[model samples]
Target chain A: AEKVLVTGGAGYIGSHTVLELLEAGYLPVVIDNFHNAFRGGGSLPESLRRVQELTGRSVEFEEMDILDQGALQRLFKKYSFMAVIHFAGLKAVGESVQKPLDYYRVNLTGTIQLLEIMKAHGVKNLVFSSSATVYGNPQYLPLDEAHPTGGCTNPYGKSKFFIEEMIRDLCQADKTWNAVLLRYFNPTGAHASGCIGEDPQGIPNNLMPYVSQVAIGRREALNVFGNDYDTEDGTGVRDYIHVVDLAKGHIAALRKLKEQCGCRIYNLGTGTGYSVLQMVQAMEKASGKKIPYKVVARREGDVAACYANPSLAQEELGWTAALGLDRMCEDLWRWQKQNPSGF
Target chain B: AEKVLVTGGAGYIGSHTVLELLEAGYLPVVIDNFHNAFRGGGSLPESLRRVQELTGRSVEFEEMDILDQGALQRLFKKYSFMAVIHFAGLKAVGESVQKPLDYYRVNLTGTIQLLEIMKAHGVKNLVFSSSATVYGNPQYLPLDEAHPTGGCTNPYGKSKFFIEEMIRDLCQADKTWNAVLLRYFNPTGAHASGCIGEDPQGIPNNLMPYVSQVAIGRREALNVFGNDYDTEDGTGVRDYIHVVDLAKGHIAALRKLKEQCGCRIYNLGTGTGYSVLQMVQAMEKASGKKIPYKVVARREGDVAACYANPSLAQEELGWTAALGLDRMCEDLWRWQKQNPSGF
Candidate 1:
């Protein structure tokens, strides 16, 4: 079996991608600092341990920080990985604005360090977990790969834009290198097993976890940001794709990386948009609970509507969002209910 | 007396800025890796030694790499720095294209590391060495601080833009932090004392150094990149600011950083445009040597014409470019004549 290295393999999307890699008959070696991960004083993080039990396959796990080049070099020496699925970094936009240095250091510097070691070890193929946040406040209806990636008002978005540019320039400099940038649009839900899911360390930064927590009695009412937007529901709308579908996109990206992809970028989205109020009602239907909510002032930097064309990924990588919003809400409600206090 | 930590204080603009800092009654503690600098097996770089001789003031020197966080922290403990004038970086644009990782690592990671230590030590003021290359192809003539940044064709320029954004975001996050971004134009010529100048290893990346080498007979005729540009003389036009004037701009920036500046950006240029032909003519008269050149194909990533609208720096910082093209050419010729092989 081919061995692949996964950075941040203990975190939400990373653990699911690790499970997907196992399902696809690939051995994964996980390297994570457990920065934003939950570990139960053990060798493997709680999420990865659940993944192992769920898949009935053991994964090589190492406690590592990508900023530490020595540790990365040693890890590279230990695993003859075919390619790398890099998904490590800080990711809270509001906190990122308050601690911009931390975001720049962890996200931008960590990615650069990972790329440095990857190049030195002759592991040039990469499936980077980029975000659609790179396309700040979409200037068009459906954001495509052609949309300009800049004007990121926050440090979190800037780090993504900067790393994408670096990866593009790196591939341009060395033709032997291959990279696929997956600009993920709003990842939510979890595996249907309810054993592992989005486990945010602090106040949830995304919509699903915050909404699920309210239903699970873990938090109070959801603070719906605005109701004055020119959307169908007068609230901000975003493309929320199922986590499992997004994980499959990574496997497809890894396959695409093998086929001479010299720095290709694709949007991993469902070609759909869900408003804040719509999400509230969807969660209520899935959880069978009255989810309390309050409308508040619009959050700074929140766009009225943002979704993805996603045709490039559909056509080029032969991948599309298969799961719908009900499946997403049901899976999320199960996970939040099973583990009200996330591991 | 106040002490300022000057990173890359052995390089061209750095050495000149060190002299200016000393003249302004501020002690400069230089930390350099001697990368892209001249060091002849001594305690200090040859350029800094000359700066000491030129200004008759001793500067504390330490061999340091900003990427080494441990060393930076130790250095911060040793000296009580008033502020930091960050000048250390990889500057070769063409080489940056060939080795994007090296450029990203040195330029982006290095600056981030420096900022981390500065923040840790409670040194909140910083004057960054930015570049006009941040303003890709000018949408309009006389590029100001409002020019949109982020679309840089090469890793070098992208690194600068990324660093500037990081600093701006950093200052915004913390009201206690203050930053001044000095976007320098085409820095040419040497100091008036002829003791220090631009000493590029191998082939020079900038026009003045290559032209200086040609006049000194170190290299053959220069290959002029694109002479059919829409300018006064059918050649690429740039805001050629003298190295001395550019160095003085740092002094002005340091003064501005003393106030409650929350991340201000200024263009350090003469606010005048000069063509390649005009520069050659000026150099010929100053050197009294036939500076030979040939019109060749335009270089990749070379803009047709780019200058600065330096009125903001002049009006706000109480600074202006006082030197002209002849003075710049004369100073450069003197330095080139004195040291055919750079120190």
Candidate 2:
């Protein structure tokens, strides 16, 4: 089996991607700082445990920070990894705005440190988990790979932009390395097993997790920050893709990355937009529980709408989001039911 | 006496600024890592000993990397400096393209490190050394502060762009802090004393220094890269501000920064463009010696023409380069003659 070194393999997207890799018969070695992960429940992060049961394989878990170059180098030497799917780095827009230095330290600086060590260990292939936030407030209806980036309003967006810039510069200087910068749209929902799902550390900053947790009685109600935008229902709209579909996209991306030694970009999205009110209604129907909500001022960094033109990925990487909104909501309700209090 | 902490004060321009600061009734303290400076040699780097000779004031030297936060904090406490005129950054463009990570690590990362320490010590002022290279290629003639930045071709320019952005972000975030970003246009020629001048430790890369060295019977001849550009002589043209005038602009900028608290930009230039042939001819006349030169192909990343709009700096900062190209060449020749081997 070709071993894949998965940085940040315990968090939401990282764990989903890990399960998909296992299902595809790839050996994954997990490295997670667990900063934004729940690790003290005696079992693996509930997501990994479910993955173990599904794939019947044990994951090699290593606690590490990408900033720790010495430890990262040792791991790179120990594991003859075929490639790296780097998904680590801090992510919180509002939090990042207040802490730009911290964001740059962890996201931009940490990626450089990881790349430095990876270069030393002769690992030239990478699948960087980039964000669509780099596109900033999209100038077009559906953001495509060619959409101009780096106009982000928040530091989280800037981090994604900075790292992407770094990788582009890296490839420009050295053509021997192959890099795939996956510009991901919103990833939500969970595995169908209902055993593991998005386990947010504190107050949920994301819409899907917050909506689910509210229905599960962890939080009383959801405060949909704004309902006065120019979109349908006067609420913000975003492209929400199933985590499993997004996870499978990564595996497909890695397969394509293995055939080249240059930089490539792909948009991972469902090519559909969901307004806040529509999502709330769908979640209520799926859960059979009314999720209470309140309208307030818009979040400082929230945009009116953000969907994707993921035709490039579909045409080139042969991947797309196969699940729809109701299935996404159903998976979310199932995961919420399984873990009333997330592990 | 008011205090100013000058990072990289052991270097050429930094040392000259220290001498001027002493003359202007301000105390100058030096902090340098000595990465590209020679303090212990037969030459003595000139700037160090010259400061003593010019004003009879001894420099408070601290040999520590500005990126080292612990050392910066210690130095800040020991000397209550009024503001920092940051000059500590890697500045080799060719080297930057090859080793961008090193340049960013030392320049951008080191800058953030110093700024964090300064903020921690209640020191909320800075005069950052930005470059016109941050403007990338000139979109129009005579670029001003309003020109769009952040599309630099090399890491040296990127570091400058990143630092400028960081400083602007800082000013936007905190109104209590003041910052002056001086974007320099082709700083050349040696100081009047010629004692502490551009002592680049390699084969010369710039026009003035190479020309001066050739006239001084050091180098064999000057290689003129890029003679096919659309200019008067079909060679590259740039706004060359004399080193002395450039040093004086720093003094003026420091004075304005001390009296205000916001983000300010000023272009330090002579407001005049000189083609390569014109400069070479002027150098021959100034040195009173024939300087042989050979025309070669245009170097990569060479722009045809780039100068500065010096009106804003003159109106707001009340500063302008008070020397012309002939005077610049004359002073450089005087320095070259006085100290054939840079002191």
Candidate 3:
């Protein structure tokens, strides 16, 4: 089997992408720090083992941080990887503002270390997990791949922008490197088996996971930041893409990386925007439970509307968002119902 | 004595800043790797030892890389710093294009590591050594502090721009953190004492060191990048400030940081422009050496006229360039002639 190295492969999107890689007939080797993912009791994460059981395929797992140079070098020497799907980073946006150092160190340093090893070992292909937050405040209605990326107030968003710029420069420095930057929008939901999903440690920073916890009675109620916005429901709007669809998009990117030889960016969103009230109504309909929420004052740095124009990915990578809002809520409800306390 | 942390204290501007900090009645603790600075087979860099002799004051020195987290944290614990003057970075534009990983790792990651330690120890004030290269092109005649900072294709320039933005976000996150980003133009010359100056390891990257080499007969000749430009001498014009004046600007920024409680940026320059031929004439008069040169093709990423409007720094920081082209050339020649082998 052609092995592909996946950093942060035990986390939400990482685990889903591992299963997708397995189903697509590619072997995956995971390297995770368990900083965000669950390390149940032993060496391998419960999510990866569950992925194996669901897909009936075994994946080689290595419990190592991307910052550990010696361990990363040994892993690179052990298995030849076709390409690297890098997802390891500090992702909490609020905590990132509070602790910018940790965000930059783990996200920026860890990435540079990993890329250096990859270059030394001649593994030049990469698919990076960037975010829509890198596009700060949207200047236009639908942010395409050509939007200028900077002025991010939070370190997490800025780290993504820095990494993207580095990869572009790295590719420009050497023609051997091929990188696919996946600027993801809001990714929600889980696998159909309800075996793996985003299990955030503390109070979730994102909108969907907080809503899921409120529906599961783990939290009191959701605090909708704004209600007087210029959107249809007077709330903030975002492009929500299903996690499974997001994982499938990675497979397409991996395939494209083999064919291309330079840095190419594609927006992996549904090209549709949904407001907060609309999301709450969809979750309520999917779970058959009322998600209690309160309309709060507008949060600082909160934009009224943000979505993506994902035609680049649709045309170039032959990838599109397959699941709708109802399916997204249904899968999220299943994962929450299956694991109430989280892994 | 009030203690101040000075990262990259063995470097060019860093070594000069240490002398100024001592003269300003503050204890400066130096941390350097001697990666770019000269060591001359000693525990401490020759520059710092000479700084002690020149200023008639002792400096606390620690040979450490900012990427070394444990050692850096221990150094922070040892001293209760009043503020931090950070000047550690890999600053070669051409080499940065060739080896971007080294530039980003040393410049970007090293900074994040140092900032994290500073936050932990409650040493909040920072005076970052930014560059005018952050201003990609001459948007206006004289670039101000409000110039947009993006479109830098090289990792070296992008790293400076990234760190400045990070420091801005970091100060915005916490009210106690005060930072002064001194965006320096082309800094040249050496200390008047002729004890310590710019000692680049390999062939010099900047214009002054390369010019000094030509005057001393160390290099065969100088290859002037461009001459057919719309200027008085038909060459690139830049705001070249003396190193001692640049060092005094740090003391001024340190004072401003003490009064302010947020991030502020000021362009440190002479508010005057000089051409390549003008610089060569001044250096020939100073060194009394026939400096041979040849005009070459225009280098990539070179702007025709890039100087700073230094009034912001003059009005806000109460600092101005004290020396002119003759003094700059004389001091540089003295240092080059005194230390032929560069310590």
Candidate 4:
């Protein structure tokens, strides 16, 4: 089995990706600083521990940060990694604006440190977790890979853009380097076993998580930002892909990295946009609870509608979202109900 | 006297800026990693030593890199810096393309580290050393401060763009934070005393330095890149500003930071375009030497022409280039001749 190094593997997407790696018969070694992860007061993060139980495979875990070059170097020496899936970074959009230095340091500096250590260890293959925010406001109906990036309004998005550019530059410099930048739209839901899901620390920043919390009676009413957008529902719309499908996209990306591809990018999305009200109603139906919400003024930097033309991923990496909205909501509700107070 | 922290103070522009800061009655503390600087066998780098000699003031020097957070915190604690004129970075455009990780690590990570330390110490004022390369290929003739940046072709330029955007985000997040990004055009020439000048290792990267080396008989004929450009001489054109005038722009920026101005940017240029052949001929006239040159193929990523509209700096910062091409050539020739081998 090819061994893969997963940074931030204790977090939501990373843990899901690590589970998929294990299921696909790939050895995953995870290093997370627990910056944005729930440690659960255990040796292993609860998400990873559950992933181990679900997959019946042991995961090599290390408590470290990507910014610490010494630890990363030692880890690389311990295991011969075939490739690295870098996902360790600060992801809060609003908090990133409030703390730009922290975002830049962890996201940009951490990626640079990991890249340096990987180069030293001759592990040149990488699958970077980029975001659709790099596209900023949509120029067209569906954002494609060719849509000009770097119009990001906040530091979190800008850090993603900067990291993508740096990785592209690295690939261009070294012919042996192979990279796939997975520009995820919105990954929600959780594993089918109802054991793991998106567990945000404070008030959830995204729509689906907040909606999940509302359905589970963890919060009052969801504040629906802007009900007067140029959409059918008059609320902001975004492409929401299930966490499982997003995890599968990583496996596909890892397969693509085996080719002679030099720094390619693909949108991991469902190619469908869901309105804020639509997501709230779906969560209400899935949880069998009346999810309340209130319309409010539009948030700054919020776009009317944004989705991905995920045809590139389907064509290039032979990957697409395998789950739909109903399954996404069902899985998310199961995880929320099972663990009312999240681990 | 208000003490200003000058990172990379042992380098060319940094040393010159330190002299100007001293003359302006500001105590400038210097820190340099000496990564791109020549450190003579003394307690101080030759550039800083020469700066002290020229200014008749002692410079507080420290052998430190901005990436060292501990060293930076210690320095910040030692001196209450009114503002920071950050000049520490990797500046070679071509080298950046080849070794982009080094560029991103040193430039972006170093700046973030410095910014973080500054925030922790409650020192929120900064004057960043930006470059015209952030403007990429010219969209218009005289690029103004409003010119859309982030179209950079190399990692070096992208690092500058990232830093500028980070500073802008920082200022937006904290009202007390003040920053000025000085987008410098072609900075050539040396001090009148000819004691300190651009000292590049290996082959010169920029046109002016290469021409100086050719005039000094240290290198062969300059390979004039693309004499078929859409310019007066059919050669690549750029706005060349004297290093002294460029240094003074920092003083002006430091003063601007004293106000309530949020993040602002100004172009430090002469508003005059000079072609490659014109620069070679000027160097010939200044050196009284037959400077040989050969028209070669246009280099990749080489723009046909690029200059700045210096009116913004003059209008906002009350700063403008006072030296012309003749003086630029004379001073560069003086330094090149005085030190046949760079110190």
Candidate 5:
């Protein structure tokens, strides 16, 4: 089996990716800082332990900082990585604006460091975790790869935009580099196993996590950011793709990257957007629990509505969001239930 | 005396700035990778030795790469410097496009590393080596700091643009960061000592060096890039400020950085343009040598004319280029005579 080096394999999406990679007959090696992760009320990080129990797969773990070039070099030599799926970046939008320096340092410069080391090791195939937020405040209904990026106001969005552009420049500079920029729309669900799921350290940032936390009794209630946007139900809309679907999409990208020569950017979504109130109602029904919620002021950098036109990705990489919103709500509710306090 | 750390303190501008620092009663510590510099005619990177002989100044030299974060951090701990004057970058316009990756690695990434180390050591006063190339082919004559940047075609220009923007972002992110971006126009000529000056390693990328080399019997003749442009001599016109004047400008910028808050940008030029033919004629008159030249096709990325406004920098930084074309040519010719093969 080809050794797949996942740079953020101990985190939420990365943990699920471990199961997917193992099921698809690829070895998974995880490198995580664990700054925002835990071991699910266990000694190890919550996500990693869940991956172990869910798939019974052996995950090679390294608690390392990617900024340390020496450590990254050592890891590269130790593992014959077929490719690197990079998902290591701070994602809190509001916190990013106030602490832009930290965001740029850890996220932007860190990614550049990763690339330099990857180039040194002759491992060029990369599947980057780019966000649809790079398409800041979408101009149209369905955002595609062709949409202009870099309008991000917060440090998190700018970090994503900057990294994406840097990767584009890298691919342009070296033809040998096979890179895929997956502009992921909001990924909301969990693994169907209910063992491995999102386990945030502090106050949850995303809507799905907050809603799930409410069901798990970890939080008081869910506070939808705003109820007065141009979106349906007068609330902000997002294309909440399933985490498992998103993880499997990485496998598809890696498989395609095995044969590709240059960068291929794709939008990973169902090309469908759902509103916040709708999501709360659905989650309530799925969990058989009425999630208390309150309307609040609109977040500073929040957009009215954003969804991906995943047609290009489907055409190019032969992949799409297979699971629907109902499945997404169901999986997330299951994860919240199994680990009542979250892993 | 306040200690100043100059990252590329032995290269063309860096060496001249060292002389200026010595004249202004400041200690200049040099750290150069020497990738694009003439190390020395024989030993000890002639520029450093020349600074000692000319001004009785001592330069603490460290031959290392700026991208080495560990070395930089160690150096920072070792020296409690007042300010950092960074001049380390590849600056060839033509070569940059073909070698974009190398340019970004050295210019952009190396600079970020330097800044990180500087901040970690609490040394925030920075005078970055920006360029008029950031203005891209200027919309109007006499480009100012407020002019738009990053629309440049070549990678070298883009690197400068990117660095300048990054510095601006850094300053906004932290109020402690004091940044002065000096956007230099054509910096030609040499020091009055005729010992240390512009010593590009390979074929001279600029016309002044090519003409001086030809006068000293190094090159056969100067292939004037273009003569069809709308100018006094129907050739490309440039600002062509003397090296001494440009170096002094750095000193002024360093002073302003220490005494001011917020990020500052200035155009370091003579507010004048001389056509290629006029410059060649001036050099011939200065050296008493018949400088032969031929008209070639206009270079792909050549601008017709570019001269700095200089008024704002003069008003703000209280500095201006004092050397005229004759003085610039004479000093360059004297340096050419002193070292046929540049040190």
Candidate 6:
């Protein structure tokens, strides 16, 4: 099994991807600063520990940051990495607005540091964790890979867009480099075992996490922002892919990187849309509890509806979302019910 | 006199700006890594030495890089800077394509480092050295400040655009910040005294420097990019402002920072256009040398005609390019004649 370096491997999607990597006969060497992940004060974060237990495999973990170039160089020198799945970054959008420098430093500068070290070590294969937010306010429905980006409203999204541009420039300059930019849509649900899931600190920022918290009594009623959108239910619609499927998308990207693809971008989504009210109803059915909610005014910068045209990923990487909304709700509820306080 | 920090204060524009700063009754503290300047192997570079001799004022100098956070912190601890004129960056468009990472690390990350240090020290006034290239291909004839930016063709221009956006976000987040993005369009010529001028290391990437080099007999006949463009002379046109006038624009920006304007952007240009043939003929008349040239195929990413409106800077910053084309050609010829081999 080839050793793959996974930055930010303790976070929700990173840990899930690490599990998928392990099950696919690959050695996942994880490095995380635990900025957005739970630090268990041990060798592994609780999420990674549970992942290891589920797979019955020993995980090689390092407590490090991408900004520390010396540490990154040392780690690269120690391991012969076949590829790097970069996920280490500051992910909160609202916090990013207040501290734009922190976002640019952590997300932009950190990626530069990692790329420099990777270039030095001759590890050119990269699978970057990008977001659909890079598409900004969707110019057209069913956002495809060719949609123009860089209309970001916040620093977090701008950082991702800048990094994407930087990586594209890198691949253009060097032919030996192979990169896969996975522009993931909303990733919800968790591992089927309910052992590893999204555990955001403080208040949750996204819809699924907040809904799950409400179902578990960790929060008050959810504020459904703008219930009078253009969708069928007069609410915002999003393409929510199961986290496990999102993780497997990383596996597909890694496999694609094995080929001589100079640089490619794919939308990892279910090719379906679900409104906010529909999500609430689905969660109520799965949690067996009425998820209370309030219809508040429209949030600024909130789009009416956003989904994906995921045919490119299907055709290119031979990957697609295998789970439906019910599975997503059931898995999310199980994870929430098992760990009310979150890990 | 208020103390001002001038980053990259040893380059062509930086040295000229420092001279203007001294003449304008401002104490300029300079820091340069000399990555693009010729070091005198002493306390100051040759350009700064000439600037001091011309202005009869001493510049406080330091040899440092912004990437060194501790060094920046110590410098902030040392000097109480009223404002910073950030000019340190990799500026060559062609080199940026070959080495995009170097451009991003030096230009983008370096700006972030300076911004972080500035915020920590509570020194919120800044005058960023932006370029007209940020506008990409002009959508209109005269590129105004309101012209949409961030359609950059290469990494060098993209870095400027990214930095400008980052600074805007910073100023928006905090009301204390005062930034002036000086979008300069083709700063050419030299100081009238011929003591300091544009001194490129290898082959010059820009037109004015290359033209001056050819007039000085250092290079052979020039190969103009194209002469089939839709212009008066069938060659591409640009708004070439005198370097000293452009340097004084910085003084105006420094003065504007005293006001409570959050973040303002202005075009530092002459509000005039000059074709390639006109510039070549003007150089021939000034240099008393029959400058030979050949018209080649148009360079990729070359615009037909690009200049600036230069009204906003005059209205707001009370600055404009006072020198005409004859003065620019004379000063450039004098500098080239005196220092055929740059200092």
Give the C-alpha miss distance for residue A236 in model 4, angstroms. 1.4
TM-score of 2: 0.92
Model 3: DockQ against the native?
Answer: 0.74
- The list of candidate 3 runs beyond 4 A from truth reads A218-221, B200-205, B217-221, B289-292
Tens-place lDDT digits, model 1, residues A12-67 = 99999999999999999998998889986568999988888999999889998998
Which residue pairs clash in candidate 2? B226-B298
- Which residue runs of candidate 6 sit more than 4 Å off their true CA positions? none
- Candidate 1 lDDT by residue in tens digits, B1-343: 5689999998989999999999989989999998888885669999999988998999899998988988998999999998999999999888899999999999999999999999998999999999989988899988999888768888999999999999989888898988999997778888987878988888887889998999999988988899887777788987898999999999999999888788899999988888888999999999999988999998877778899899999899999999999999999999999988889
For candidate 6, the per-residue lDDT at A79 reads: 94
List where candidate 2 sits over 4 angstroms from the true fold.
A42-54, A218-221, A224-230, A298-303, B1-3, B41-46, B67-79, B201-205, B217-221, B225-229, B297-301, B341-343
TM-scores for all candidates: the values are 0.98, 0.92, 0.94, 0.98, 0.90, 0.99
lDDT of 6 by residue, B1-343 (tens): 4589999999989999999999988999999998989988578999998888898899899999878888999999999988999999889889999999999999998999999998998899999999988888999979998888886999999999999999999998998999999997788899999888998888888888889889988989888999999999899998899999999999999999989788999998889899988999999999988888899999999988999899999999988789999899999999989998889
Please give the lDDT score at residue A219 for candidate 2.
Answer: 84
Off by over 4 Å in 1: none
lDDT tens digits by residue: candidate 3, A247-318:
999999999988964899999988899999999999999999989999999999989999999999999999
Listed in order, the DockQ scores are 0.95, 0.41, 0.74, 0.94, 0.33, 0.90
Q: Choose 3 or 4, whichever is better by lDDT.
A: 4
Question: A1-343, model 2: which lDDT tens digit per residue?
Answer: 5589999899889998998888888999998888888774555765676678877888778888987767888898888888999988888877776766677777866788778877877788999999998888889979998898876787778778877877887788888889999988778898898877888778888899999988888888899888889897999998898999999989988998878849999999889899999999999999998899999899876789999888999998989789999999999999889888877
lDDT of 3 by residue, B129-223 (tens): 99888888878978898788876777888999988888887887788899999987777889987878887555445588888889998888888
Q: For candidate 1, list the clashing residue pairs, or say none.
A: none
For model 1, state the Cα shift of residue A313 in Å: 0.9
Q: Which CAPRI quality tier does the interface of model 1 achieve? A: high
* Candidate 6 lDDT tens digits, A63-158: 998999889989998999999999999888889889899999999999999999999999999999998888999989899988999878889899
Q: Looking at the true structure's interface, with contacts defined as alpha carbon pairs within 8 Å between chains A and B, what fraction does model 1 recover?
A: 0.98
Residue A69 Cα positional deviation in candidate 4, in Å, after optimal superposition:
1.9
Candidate maximizing lDDT: 6
In order, the Cα lDDT scores of the candidates are 0.90, 0.83, 0.89, 0.90, 0.82, 0.91
